[PDB]
Amino acid sequence: SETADLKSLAKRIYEAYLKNFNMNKVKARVILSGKASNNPPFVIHDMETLCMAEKTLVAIQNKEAEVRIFHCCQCTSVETVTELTEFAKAIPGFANLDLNDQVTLLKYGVYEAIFAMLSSVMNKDGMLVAYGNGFITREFLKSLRKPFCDIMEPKFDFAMKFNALELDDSDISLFVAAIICCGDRPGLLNVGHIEKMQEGIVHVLRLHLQSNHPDDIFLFPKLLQKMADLRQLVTEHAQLVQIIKKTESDAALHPLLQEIYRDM
Amino acid sequence: SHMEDSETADLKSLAKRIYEAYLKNFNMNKVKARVILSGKANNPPFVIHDMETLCMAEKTLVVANGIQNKEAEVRIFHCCQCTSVETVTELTEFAKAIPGFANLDLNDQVTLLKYGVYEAIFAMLSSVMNKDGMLVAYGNGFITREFLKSLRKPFCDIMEPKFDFAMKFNALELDDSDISLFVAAIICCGDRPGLLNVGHIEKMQEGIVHVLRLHLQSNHPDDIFLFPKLLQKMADLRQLVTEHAQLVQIIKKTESDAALHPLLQEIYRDM
Ligand SMILES: COC(=O)N(CC(=O)O)Cc1cccc(OCc2nc(-c3ccc(Cl)cc3)oc2C)c1
Ligand SMILES: COC(=O)N(CC(=O)O)Cc1cccc(OCc2nc(-c3ccc(Cl)cc3)oc2C)c1
């Protein structure tokens, strides 16, 4: 045993994952079963059901129904950004880094990470919203007017492909941690150590997937591709967001998310 | 007041003569298709969702004589054509059965058909589709939309746009009585280029359009504006077909193992 060091680290990240994230694949897959355990979610398929949801599920009414979704989306992503930061701090090594390195990894990582975890609450028909109490159809999102329907579709594409890997929360913890702890991110200060720290989380991820998915020994290689597809997905997302802000008159970009995009 | 007059018994006759012609000449219809999809029909469809079930399908559904060893995308491509060629035939027989259609100039019979057939195929294709996939092989098969997306460019760009159409179209909750009339109005279009007796064909559409109007008002008095909604769909199909005409040519012009059926070639020549 020298890897007894590593098997440890894997639980430390995954505990941090279970702690700092209210929404997880195992919880999300149980909800959408039909083995609902209590009440099932509430489905949104159009207006009527949307505005019944905007009643019972949120805290708006003045505005068009497209921007309601657009704004609601940011409420969720900001919460998640917060959860992601608390999770980043609970990664061994992350705290040790320059303050301005802790901010940069987080800047370029959070979205790649949001969309990877977003797959957990998506299937082909829709996604789990409002803390898991709601569910909005993919169809409904596509049957919204341009350019707002071009928003969510590409993420569904990603998720279907992603959930085909049939990863679990233990895999997703390490995977997400490999996304945050990335040495590519422009403007890093201690580039060499972030890399040594990456190559370390990458190692445990590789071996974990080999214990958990012996049935596909090439899963890790495939996650490195998904990591690639995520960076493009985010670049793509950056622009669809820019555009909607610089055209659509009632489009309100939260100042935190604005900053994240600043100099994308 | 008044019982039913024969100026409008002529109309329920038309909507009646057309509907039967539709049942006579189309092997697949919306009533059949939904029964097959609910699994309330009795060895149900066979799901295709990967390479294995694709290949193990062609074995027990179509074995390929002159295709056995091609790629996987080009199989679907060719497979698709067998179905549409079989549909054009069914569409032509159905067109011969529309009152007035046989009476038209022989060239006019084939021009209305040239421009109508794809508009009608995709309109009717909606019957065999849901959000997940579509019925294939005379009903006995089923292929995931998912799987059709999970092919490469530009092959996976073919079938998606028709799923967009169909989901919106099926939301109109139309039935075979409506579709029969709608298809007839598609074929009988006074709009199509190079027509030889444009005035009579105009008049002919107008009659079929008028029957469709009142039939929709009867069978769907809950959406009194179903008819206009359907006029929009005609438009949506013209462009769906147009876009489709160009992705086919691309796939012909580029993809070196993409054969276009010679009947379909002729059809496409000039759109
Ligand atoms: C611009 O919006 C986005 O596409 N995103 C937010 C961002 O850029 O920060 C991406 C994104 C990230 C995470 C989740 C997300 O969508 C969640 C989400 N939540 C709703 C919604 C609408 C009404 C009610 Cl009552 C409840 C929920 O819709 C959606 C798509 C969307
Ligand atoms: C070029 O092919 C096409 O996209 N089309 C044909 C054409 O243009 O004439 C459009 C089209 C028209 C009508 C139906 C259609 O889809 C039927 C269809 N049938 C299959 C298939 C594949 C393997 C097996 Cl074993 C069985 C069936 O796939 C598809 C899409 C597709």
UniProtKB/Swiss-Prot annotation, chain A:
Main location: nucleus
Result of changing residue 219 to R: No effect on heterodimerization with RXRA nor on DNA binding and transactivation activity
Domain NR LBD residue range list: 42-263
Annotated site residues (Essential for heterodimerization with RXRA) in this chain: 230
Cellular location(s): Nucleus
Expression induction or repression: Down-regulated by aging.
Tissue: Skeletal muscle, liver, heart and kidney. Expressed in monocytes.
Residues that hold indeglitazar according to the record: 77, 111, 261
GO molecular function: DNA binding; DNA-binding transcription activator activity; DNA-binding transcription activator activity, RNA polymerase II-specific; DNA-binding transcription factor activity; DNA-binding transcription factor activity, RNA polymerase II-specific; DNA-binding transcription repressor activity, RNA polymerase II-specific; lipid binding; MDM2/MDM4 family protein binding
Region (Required for heterodimerization with RXRA): 101-230
Keywords noted in UniProt: Activator, Biological rhythms, DNA-binding, Lipid-binding, Metal-binding, Nucleus, Receptor, Transcription, Transcription regulation, Ubl conjugation, Zinc, Zinc-finger
Effect the entry attributes to changing residue 228 to T: No effect on heterodimerization with RXRA nor on DNA binding
One Gene Ontology term from the biological process aspect of the record: positive regulation of transcription by RNA polymerase II
Biological role: Ligand-activated transcription factor. Key regulator of lipid metabolism. Activated by the endogenous ligand 1-palmitoyl-2-oleoyl-sn-glycerol-3-phosphocholine (16:0/18:1-GPC). Activated by oleylethanolamide, a naturally occurring lipid that regulates satiety. Receptor for peroxisome proliferators such as hypolipidemic drugs and fatty acids. Regulates the peroxisomal beta-oxidation pathway of fatty acids. Functions as a transcription activator for the ACOX1 and P450 genes. Transactivation activity requires heterodimerization with RXRA and is antagonized by NR2C2.
Subunit structure: Heterodimer; with RXRA. This heterodimerization is required for DNA binding and transactivation activity. Interacts with NCOA3 coactivator. Interacts with CITED2; the interaction stimulates its transcriptional activity. Also interacts with PPARBP in vitro. Interacts with AKAP13, LPIN1, PRDM16 and coactivator NCOA6. Interacts with ASXL1 and ASXL2. Interacts with PER2. Interacts with SIRT1; the interaction seems to be modulated by NAD(+) levels. Interacts with CRY1 and CRY2.
Similarity remark: Belongs to the nuclear hormone receptor family. NR1 subfamily.
Protein name listed in UniProt: Peroxisome proliferator-activated receptor alpha
Lineage: Eukaryota, Metazoa, Chordata, Craniata, Vertebrata
Full-length numbering of the shown residues: 198 to 467 of 468
From Swiss-Prot, chain B:
Region described as Required for heterodimerization with RXRA: spans on this chain: 108-237
Tissues/organs with expression: Skeletal muscle, liver, heart and kidney. Expressed in monocytes.
CC annotations in GO: chromatin; nucleoplasm; nucleus
Outcome (variant: residue 237 to R): Abolishes heterodimerization with RXRA, DNA binding and transactivation activity
Subunit comment: Heterodimer; with RXRA. This heterodimerization is required for DNA binding and transactivation activity. Interacts with NCOA3 coactivator. Interacts with CITED2; the interaction stimulates its transcriptional activity. Also interacts with PPARBP in vitro. Interacts with AKAP13, LPIN1, PRDM16 and coactivator NCOA6. Interacts with ASXL1 and ASXL2. Interacts with PER2. Interacts with SIRT1; the interaction seems to be modulated by NAD(+) levels. Interacts with CRY1 and CRY2.
Summary of the function given for this chain in its UniProt record: Ligand-activated transcription factor. Key regulator of lipid metabolism. Activated by the endogenous ligand 1-palmitoyl-2-oleoyl-sn-glycerol-3-phosphocholine (16:0/18:1-GPC). Activated by oleylethanolamide, a naturally occurring lipid that regulates satiety. Receptor for peroxisome proliferators such as hypolipidemic drugs and fatty acids. Regulates the peroxisomal beta-oxidation pathway of fatty acids. Functions as a transcription activator for the ACOX1 and P450 genes. Transactivation activity requires heterodimerization with RXRA and is antagonized by NR2C2.
Name of the protein this chain belongs to: Peroxisome proliferator-activated receptor alpha
Gene that encodes it: PPARA
Span within the parent record: 196 to 467 of 468
